[PDB]
Amino acid sequence: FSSKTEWRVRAISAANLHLRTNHIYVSSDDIKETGYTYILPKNVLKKFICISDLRAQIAGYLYGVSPPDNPQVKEIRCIVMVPQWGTHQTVHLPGQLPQHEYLKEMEPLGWIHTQPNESPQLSPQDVTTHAKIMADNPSWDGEKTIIITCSFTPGSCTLTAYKLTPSGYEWGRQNTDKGNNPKGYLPSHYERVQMLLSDRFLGFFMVPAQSSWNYNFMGVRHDPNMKYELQLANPKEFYHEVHRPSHFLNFALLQEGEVYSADREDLYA
Amino acid sequence: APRQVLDLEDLVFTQGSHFMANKRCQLPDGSFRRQRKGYEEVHVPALKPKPFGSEEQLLPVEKLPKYAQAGFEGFKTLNRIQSKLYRAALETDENLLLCAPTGAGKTNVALMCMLREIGKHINMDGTINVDDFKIIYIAPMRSLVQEMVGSFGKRLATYGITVAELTGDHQLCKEEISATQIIVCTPEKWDIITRKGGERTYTQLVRLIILDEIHLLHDDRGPVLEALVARAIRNIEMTQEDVRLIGLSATLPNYEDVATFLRVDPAKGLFYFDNSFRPVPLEQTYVGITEKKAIKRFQIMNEIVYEKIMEHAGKNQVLVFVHSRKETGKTARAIRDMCLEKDTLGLFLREGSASTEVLRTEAEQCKNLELKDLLPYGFAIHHAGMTRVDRTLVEDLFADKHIQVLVSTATLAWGVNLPAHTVIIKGTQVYSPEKGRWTELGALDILQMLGRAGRPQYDTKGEGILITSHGELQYYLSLLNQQLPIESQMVSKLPDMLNAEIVLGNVQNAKDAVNWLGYAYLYIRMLRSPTLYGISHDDLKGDPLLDQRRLDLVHTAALMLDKNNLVKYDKKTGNFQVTELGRIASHYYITNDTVQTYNQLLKPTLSEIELFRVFSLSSEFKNITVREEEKLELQKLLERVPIPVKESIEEPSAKINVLLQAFISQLKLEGFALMADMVYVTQSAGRLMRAIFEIVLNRGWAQLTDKTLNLCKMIDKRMWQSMCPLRQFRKLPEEVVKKIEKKNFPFERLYDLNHNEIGELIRMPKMGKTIHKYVHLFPKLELSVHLQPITRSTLKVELTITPDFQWDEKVHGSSEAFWILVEDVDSEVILHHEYFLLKAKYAQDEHLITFFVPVFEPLPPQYFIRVVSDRWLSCETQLPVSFRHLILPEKYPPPTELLDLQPLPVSALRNSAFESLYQDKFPFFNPIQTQVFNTVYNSDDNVFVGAPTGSGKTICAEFAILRMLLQSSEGRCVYITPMEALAEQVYMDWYEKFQDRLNKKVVLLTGETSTDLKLLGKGNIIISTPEKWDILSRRWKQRKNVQNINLFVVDEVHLIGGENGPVLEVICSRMRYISSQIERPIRIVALSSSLSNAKDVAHWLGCSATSTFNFHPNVRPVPLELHIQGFNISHTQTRLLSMAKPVYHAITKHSPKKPVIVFVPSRKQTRLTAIDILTTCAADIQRQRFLHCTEKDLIPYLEKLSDSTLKETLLNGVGYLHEGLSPMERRLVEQLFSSGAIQVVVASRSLCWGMNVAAHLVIIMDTQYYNGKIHAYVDYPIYDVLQMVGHANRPLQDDEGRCVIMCQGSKKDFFKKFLYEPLPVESHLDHCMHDHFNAEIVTKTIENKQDAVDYLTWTFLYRRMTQNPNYYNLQGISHRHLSDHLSELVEQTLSDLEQSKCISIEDEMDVAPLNLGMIAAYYYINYTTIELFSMSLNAKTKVRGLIEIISNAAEYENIPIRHHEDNLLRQLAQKVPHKLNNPKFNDPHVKTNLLLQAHLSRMQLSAELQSDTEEILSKAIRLIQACVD
């Protein structure tokens, strides 16, 4: 980013993200039928789209349970936002997975992220990210956890859901190179999975304890090994004042400017 | 006749206060016109003082009354005019008007008018006791207000009376200015503050208002003064309580018109003095310039300045008023460089080289301003901008005459007072950002600055020189000699004025509107000069009173307000209705075009980017435009702003936006035009942004109310949030702040660090302590929440706010304001919000707020409870409330349908003797009764009947009683009600119903065990309250009279829900246990209001579902119309006061001719509200409308009265009922009401239960009440409210019954939900538990832990626990869940009971009562009480100790604390035999100690606390005996 002009164009843009919110598409494609099927409550989806930005990827972590007596469907009941920052093609979020009390009741279902340009494939950066989570986390089950990619289409939003195949998981554990075309990448690595939106139940948010989630505007304050706690509260928007301290901390001024126009007229209170 | 719409545009006066209504002017005597090239110059000489009249002398400060003389020190004699009117000043309440020239010293006249009132309240042994009166001084200018409070303070200080400026934001300083008298303010301030109601707590304590410089009537600001005074007068006509009004004006014609306006009797009240009375005679010079081209003009005026100034260059003094900031010093240095260009001519401003102190001007050398250049020479400059102290240092220099040339601004004339030998006004034109252009300065500005001409002391006569444009030259003559009419600009503002009056409720309809306008200055002007105001004389003759013009006028205002949605007013009725938009508009003094712009523009989804634009579109800014020259700088500013404007290009929107940002971002601007503009924008911005916040918050749209309150704060504080909060403490160094901003270390992480760890971050350790202070000065709340589900739809939230910050009144001041708002799952919708205000006293005291919130069908992961300071920026705390574990209650089955039955005649029961006690009362039983009948009467089984209060369940009980009557001669029946009042109320009926007619003996239980025992068993029907029937019947095993009862009746069982409910629950349960052991069935009949969970109650009390009748509140014999009225004023006094008028209106609307009961929060409030009902009764022009008999008939009743005011209120048909009234007085009032003599009775809330007289309309006023113990208000218990509502029932006659409940904003939704639906009821036994286990263990009903659990299973708690487990903090609905829960329960109850030595627990299994518990159980005393006794009473204790030990008893904490009982009990405690060790006077134990000693000393106290004393004494002996034991 240009860090001056580049900030503002996208900033007055993102104030319209809520317009997208009511036009969304969902990939319908061939159902494995032996697979799990994930239901995403619409409210969290709306809010998640609304906090995002149209260039930097933001990501969120999925937490849910399967409804009683129906083990093959996973309701996503919660999204957790952790300290993070994006690129246009990927997202850097820390090594620690969410730990918190409200979360103990549910299982992790993977993660969801915004995708500035729509691609009909799981980006190598993603399969690599996911495998590398999975390597370090037994908590995440290969077969149960997914990557939901939410892409910004014109005036719209459109989303797909992927699972790593074991081929993919091994490639990704192995993979170093984060470029858009790493060696040995294959369409054999991922698999699409069945997902539905729902108005039947409401999902909720988990959000960083002492800060907010969006570190894009401080990259030096973000570290892979950084630790965080959580709370029950909603995410602030991308360009929200808090995510942007450096800019509100731009004041170089001498007080005596106030000497000029010392006619104080007030008369009201 | 029907009204017609007119155009208010061509009907106003543009360029107001420059108006010049007369087109002809006059010479003075020796005046001449001499025209030069390019400029006409007019000269008038000084006036000739009127020769002293025969035997007319000045008054010294001696010969005027003794008291007032104080504070006049330094002044030996009164001014001629002061001396003229002092008599009427101090000897009459007649209103005043004086017209006297500038310099006559008008203030000291008005001062006397104040010293009279200050004297009206005086005592011998104390002076000027200050809570009787307050005075309001309205002055036109701010500087003038400041300086006036400054000197008034000094002067009046001898009296010790506290006078202050009213700059207060409404809420933080009200309770501050509560203690303030003689408050000074600008008319505007008074108008907003009255529109909000900050005044309505002050008024009626106001006997005097001063209008100073009332000629401001002619200014655009005029309508405000017109609005003030009109309101004051129109109000006095309603209240009949009068006020003095003292007007002060410059000398101008239309004096008699202003007189009419102020209701000044021209005879004794009018005072006029012409321009000859100026203390320093004024020679007037006026030079108008004919030059059209401005380029040549800006030379010509320079040169006129030079010649005029060189004229006085000898021994004399000149003062130049320029209207520019910078040009104060641009005008100087022109004179200087000219004097240098003069070949050193004009110089030597002294008597010599060294003479006249040129070393004075040289030795003062180094100064803050540009003075260093000018000071070595003869002249200098003055203004507010460049310096603070050096202004005072220049004023000192001018007074002592070391500078004979001073160029300055109008704020110098309006500020601290110094004159000049001759003053010169350069140009008269100023820049008006409000008007968007340049305009000639106001009347008061010149009048003030030219009234500075000449000294009172060092001068002979003053001169003044006004350099203006020739075209305006006529105008400025019509002023400074009295030619100018004072006219009203009121028409321009008429739509805005009307709104605010509807908003205050002072105008309901068109008629009240014309009545109001009939009090305006514009009215008398339209009367006496119709030709000017747009009325031809012929149609004036056609309508002499202007009824049809005042009807046409205001009709257009009504239409404008309707079209912008400030008011809903239909032409047919002529009535107005206020909308919240209207209120917001009035409260912020924002125009009605701006507000509709906001209505259409504002949507939930608005970004900051857009919020600013909407702000920029405010109609208040309509004339602001963007100039070519400044579009160069605006672009730079546009790229240096944080919030993108880029939606807009260069147009007014952009200019205003970038300006607001510039101000917040704190940016200095090169152009002067832009500076003034920016100032305008930002000053109006506070009110504007705030009205936005209020609107958008009332809508409930969370995100935008955040963005808008934050904007408000950013405007107030002049910074963005991205800057360190420490900046709001201005006490802090800038470099330190910038330093902590340098390193990014999130602010809330400063609390973890100590004084040293702080300084280590910025490597400035010397600061380490001071920083720390501020970090802990910054307001911080921590908050906890206790949440329990009520119904599947609603949860209850108890928020506990604990102050985490160190209070300093030099920072936080008297009060700190916080919004608490609970937001939904996405932080999208605001489900609920309250305004919470923590006062000074109560920092560190945790406050408890209780409120309900709804839940919805996709049950969400959590809500959020947000709390944010109003004024404080970056100060917020959020609290996730997680539902992850929430278990919602089982949805409630539909109420049993009301069957359609042939209404049962009394002829049903075949018993004639029974028929007799009904037939002559009502012909038919109601559908409820007739549906219950066969089950309750012809059949023997337990029934439950819920129906909402007013359904007639009492005779449903009487059915069962009659059945038992047939069953046996001696048949025994016990009847229970939770309210003792209700019990006596039942007894009075049933004693005649049964004992009188049916010969069957009827009794009513009492305190004493013995007498009570004897009572039952002689009686067939035993009426009692749960506590009386607990103590007796705990021992039931031994008392055969308990066991042998045939029937058992529980009335109002839903009351289980409330406190003193557990005892009810426990006695019904016990009753069942007895029927278990007695082997005979004991029929139980329970009666409740509509109950959602009635099933549980029935299952508990053993009713088959077939005999269970639970009815919906919509089933009532007489239908009810319920209305709820929300009031947004949180401060309870103001709220309670502002619902006064609505009460009257609620009567006139809902029940004009029918009986009306009004319930009130306070014992005393009943009087006051009866009064107010009568005083606003006069308003209607309708007097004594509520009295239905002649005064001759009421005399026999009034002979029995003590209370004198009650006589009055009764005389007009009202009357009241409360604690203090003698039972005869009460009986009388009740009689008068029911008989139909008086139509309205105001009653204390306490009397809702025990009142035997019903009504048609019931109005509940303000559902909160005051509790001294936590020092806060607390809501009416819901069942109470339902009872008050049920008090509107008149089945005999009315086809309907009506209720209006006026309550706070917060409490609105709660009533909307729970008054209509059937009610849920939960058990409280889990909390109040020990006492009963103890007592029961004593009877050996619980022999061991097992028996304890078993006992638990007989309760209603047992029933409910699995129904709504989250309420009882039971975490699962399972079997072992409930089992483990009850287990843990008896476990800890028995443990706590064993710790207290009331029982002994053997083997861990068995239990036995011990000494303590035995005592407790015997005397029916709380167990903690006698434990306290156990650790308190020692070997050496005596009556001194026994008093306090018996006082701390638990049964004495039921004793409450009333409004300001902290001083009362202190005054009593002073004079009692035994003093106390640092007693807190809000504590009921202390109060009972003091009341007890008072009783021992036979001191007669007020009946208020005497009642209390009696109640203490009632239960005293038992406690005493327990101590003996």
From Swiss-Prot, chain A:
This is Pre-mRNA-processing-splicing factor 8. Widely expressed. Plays a role in pre-mRNA splicing as core component of precatalytic, catalytic and postcatalytic spliceosomal complexes, both of the predominant U2-type spliceosome and the minor U12-type spliceosome. Functions as a scaffold that mediates the ordered assembly of spliceosomal proteins and snRNAs. Required for the assembly of the U4/U6-U5 tri-snRNP complex, a building block of the spliceosome. Functions as a scaffold that positions spliceosomal U2, U5 and U6 snRNAs at splice sites on pre-mRNA substrates, so that splicing can occur. Interacts with both the 5' and the 3' splice site. Part of the U5 snRNP complex. Component of the U4/U6-U5 tri-snRNP complex composed of the U4, U6 and U5 snRNAs and at least PRPF3, PRPF4, PRPF6, PRPF8, PRPF31, SNRNP200, TXNL4A, SNRNP40, DDX23, CD2BP2, PPIH, SNU13, EFTUD2, SART1 and USP39. Component of the U5.U4atac/U6atac snRNP complexes in U12-dependent spliceosomes. Within the minor spliceosome, which acts on U12-type introns, interacts with PPIL2 and RBM48. Core component of U2-type precatalytic, catalytic and postcatalytic spliceosomal complexes. Found in a mRNA splicing-dependent exon junction complex (EJC) with SRRM1. Residues 37-168 form the MPN domain. It is linked to Retinitis pigmentosa 13: A retinal dystrophy belonging to the group of pigmentary retinopathies. Retinitis pigmentosa is characterized by retinal pigment deposits visible on fundus examination and primary loss of rod photoreceptor cells followed by secondary loss of cone photoreceptors. Patients typically have night vision blindness and loss of midperipheral visual field. As their condition progresses, they lose their far peripheral visual field and eventually central vision as well. The lineage of its organism: Eukaryota, Metazoa, Chordata, Craniata, Vertebrata. It comes from the Eukaryota. It comes from Homo sapiens. The chain holds residues 2067 to 2335 of 2335 of the full protein. It is found in: Nucleus; Nucleus speckle.
From Swiss-Prot, chain B:
The chain holds residues 404 to 1928 of 2136 of the full protein. Its EC number is 3.6.4.13. It catalyses: ATP + H2O = ADP + phosphate + H(+). A motif (DEIH box) lies at residues 212-215. ATP binds at residues 100-107, 947-954. GO terms for cellular component: catalytic step 2 spliceosome; cilium; membrane; nucleoplasm; nucleus; plasma membrane; spliceosomal complex; U2-type catalytic step 1 spliceosome. Residues 578-883 form the SEC63 domain. The keyword Phosphoprotein applies. This is U5 small nuclear ribonucleoprotein 200 kDa helicase. Component of a core complex containing at least PRPF8, SNRNP200, EFTUD2 and SNRNP40. Component of the U5 snRNP and U4/U6-U5 tri-snRNP complexes, building blocks of the spliceosome. Component of the U4/U6-U5 tri-snRNP complex composed of the U4, U6 and U5 snRNAs and at least PRPF3, PRPF4, PRPF6, PRPF8, PRPF31, SNRNP200, TXNL4A, SNRNP40, DDX23, CD2BP2, PPIH, SNU13, EFTUD2, SART1 and USP39. Component of precatalytic, catalytic and postcatalytic spliceosomal complexes. Component of the minor spliceosome, which splices U12-type introns. Changing H1145A: Strongly decreases ATP-dependent RNA helicase activity. It comes from Homo sapiens. Contains two helicase domains. The N-terminal helicase domain has catalytic activity by itself, contrary to the C-terminal helicase domain that may have a regulatory role and enhance the activity of the first helicase domain. It is found in: Nucleus. Residues 281-518, 1142-1350 form the Helicase C-terminal domain. Changing F1333L: In a colorectal cancer sample; somatic mutation. One of its GO terms (molecular function) is RNA helicase activity.
